[PDB]
Symmetry: C2
């Protein structure tokens, strides 16, 4: 079906029609974008905290205001979805969700309280789209630049009452009803190991150093357990490139960092009146992102390679995580760099989807975040920074929603876009739980 090849400003920004992104009437192109046929595969790309503001800021900096992101902006069907959480005590809406509650909403189809993973407000477990895809015989992949125990990758495989229950120790004190030695299903990491997705790639190697408190692998570290269970462990780009097959008999687990994988671009933090008092910043590539550390695009590509060998089809979730993290850290360059990172992964996904013809690609965010693009002369109360964009002009970014350093999430609805079979279901206003039902129905899961 047609991908948007170029929606950059067609000419001279200062002349009549020069800033147009369209060259003609779109009715025919959109008609050719609509198909209700079954989706053989689904690739879901999540930008953590990548609301419309974050996409505009990153486009302005990296591609220029009249620029176009060949991945993110190329998806033809667009809509806006809501992502509120629930108050555990009252069952009433809680308008600003955290990563755990939003993640659970699109992976299980039920709203929950902030902090829950894979359970509803009554702490009852609900099956995730990954578990269901596995059950139906599809290949499954879970890729992230964050720790694999963080909310978005974890929600596909774990069901715990608190996102904080990363490994055995944390689970024993914070999630005692889930603690393995108290008869529960285990921590996020133990449940991840039990879930056995075919490809799992990300950081968070640190928690695999913990020893299981109970069960068959009591006393062994979760890394030893993974090896003993038949997992192919990979810890750098060379080893990852050597993997020829990844399947239920030999599942791939790539741990490329102790915590979160390295950020792509470095820059200073935004400061009080940073746009008034400090020079404009040009982001610099991070020397430590390294030739041995696979990029999000490389991990997506390897995952698509391995997963596409399953004739039944696959489900792959890819997360550009440190957008959110750096947005909390009020660091424009880190944030924008990770949106650029995600765009590359979305490009790889779109390329495959174009030629394969039966893949639904969906790009969206879990919740909106704090950054706002403000006028150059803004005298703001929070943190600000002036950035030198691709256009050679200054763009100021403001983070003004918290005094407690981390700039919070916000409740605004945001863009969801798709390409492929059943993509129509993201157009107009939808809710994050509708995404679960769209993916389930597209894939023919029951």
């Amino acid at each position: 079906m047609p991908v948007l090849e170029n929606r950059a400003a067609q000419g001279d920004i200062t002349a009549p029609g020069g800033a147009r992104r369209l060259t003609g009437d779109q009715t025919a192109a959109l008609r050719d974008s609509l198909s209700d046929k079954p989706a053989k595969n689904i690739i879901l790309l999540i930008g953590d905290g990548m609301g419309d503001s974050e996409i505009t800021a990153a486009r302005n900096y990296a591609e220029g205001a009249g620029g176009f992101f060949k991945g993110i902006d190329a998806l033809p069907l667009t809509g806006q979805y809501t992502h509120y959480a629930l108050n555990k005590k009252t069952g009433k809406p809680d308008y600003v969700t955290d990563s755990a509650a939003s993640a659970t909403a699109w992976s299980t189809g039920v709203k929950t309280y902030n902090g829950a993973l894979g359970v509803d407000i009554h702490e009852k477990d609900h099956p995730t789209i990954l578990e269901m895809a596995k059950a139906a015989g599809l290949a499954t992949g879970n890729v992230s630049t964050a720790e694999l125990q963080d909310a978005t990758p974890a929600a596909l495989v774990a069901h715990v009452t608190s996102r904080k229950c990363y490994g055995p120790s944390a689970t024993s004190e914070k999630c005692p009803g889930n603690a393995l030695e108290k008869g529960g299903k285990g921590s996020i990491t133990e449940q991840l190991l039990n879930a056995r997705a075919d490809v799992t790639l990300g950081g968070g190697a640190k928690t695999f150093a913990e020893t299981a408190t109970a069960g068959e692998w009591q006393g062994k570290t979760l890394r030893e357990q993974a090896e003993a269970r038949g997992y192919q462990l990979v810890s750098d780009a060379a080893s990852l490139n050597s993997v020829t097959e990844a399947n239920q008999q030999k599942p791939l687990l790539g741990l490329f960092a102790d915590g979160n994988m390295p950020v792509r671009w470095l820059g200073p933090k935004a400061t009080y009146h940073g746009n008034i008092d400090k020079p404009a910043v040009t982001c610099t590539p991070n020397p430590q992102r390294n030739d041995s550390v696979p990029t999000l695009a490389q991990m997506t590509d390897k995952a698509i390679e391995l997963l596409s060998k399953n004739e039944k089809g696959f489900f792959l979730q890819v997360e550009g995580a440190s957008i959110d993290k750096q947005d909390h850290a009020a660091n424009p360059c880190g944030q924008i760099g990770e949106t650029v990172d995600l765009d590359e992964a979305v490009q790889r996904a779109l390329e495959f989807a174009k030629k394969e013809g039966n893949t639904l690609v969906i790009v969206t965010a879990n919740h909106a975040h704090a950054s706002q693009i403000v006028a150059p002369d803004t005298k703001a109360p929070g943190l600000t920074q002036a950035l030198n964009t691709k256009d050679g002009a200054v763009m100021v970014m403001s983070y003004g929603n918290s005094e407690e350093d981390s700039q919070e999430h916000t409740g605004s609805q945001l863009r969801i876009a798709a390409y492929g079979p059943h993509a129509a279901n993201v157009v107009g206003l939808t809710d994050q739980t509708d995404l679960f039902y769209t993916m389930k129905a597209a894939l023919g899961l029951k």
Copy 2:
């Protein structure tokens, strides 16, 4: 073509699938929404500052988080468009536009500098979609809750170098090259009178009290000039309801307020730590919005009545103005009340469009604004307020982008939605200038 009848959460928010807004696959409904046939009429509804955040806040308060705005959310084709302005000196992007530069972009199709009305960075005039529609023989209407000299209604009829040139005196000092007594075309109000749209309704009666400095009506007030030129002047709801015809021979000019028309709901201003220190607010209806002052919905309805009698078709622009104004004023209730106001007008427009079958209805904003929905416990540096929503839960709103009281506009891309012929052209990423070309081509204007 189908309007979205109900995309409210279909059930119990706490149960599986209970928060879904979709009941089935949307491919067929979207296919029936696509038509490239000519649009006989266009109704453009602009929410001043109504970015996605403002729509989410207003929906949460008035309809509840799982609620649905029968007007605003009922439009089936949705996209996101960019709205950057230009720096007059360099011609480079200026990422945060003001009302004048955004208004000029969709009404003429050329980007301009902040503060310009109907002229490009070289101060050259470009014809507006209204002027072009008149020229082609279509009926034209310009409705707003703001002063008719404010940027959005003014941009359809005036071409001046500064939005501040409301009437003769202001134009003489701020726009001397436009000043009538210096051989220019006149002020915003004089040019509005010369432009002679069939229906013009809004506030701003104050500037009509000024006397023309030169020309045929030198020494008469602009009100006297309007009467003398054949304009039917109306100043309240009863008189407006009495108008049976409005046309070029007897154009309607309704001046319902000296400045901006009254706000719908009252509430206190957001304050530093207002969510921590003060009780939650319930907005109250404004006693002064009055039974003699027509609502935006009433003015839209009367305008559609009068304008639809022109067998050629019509162009109508309707502006819900005080969303922006109250957003600058950090007043949640004023802001949300005006989004509710606009929703009613969008409903009237959609009703007509449904039965008429050849009308393109477009709902969007000029730029994004400051309000963010944050967590109840937020310790924010700006202004905050806790609101009691339709759900019986608290929602906190933050305005943290300026210390100089007025909370600024922001550069984020925002929702644009449409229904009717050529509505496909708003889906995906577009630019505000594309809206001019979409309207022109839909209407068959040359």
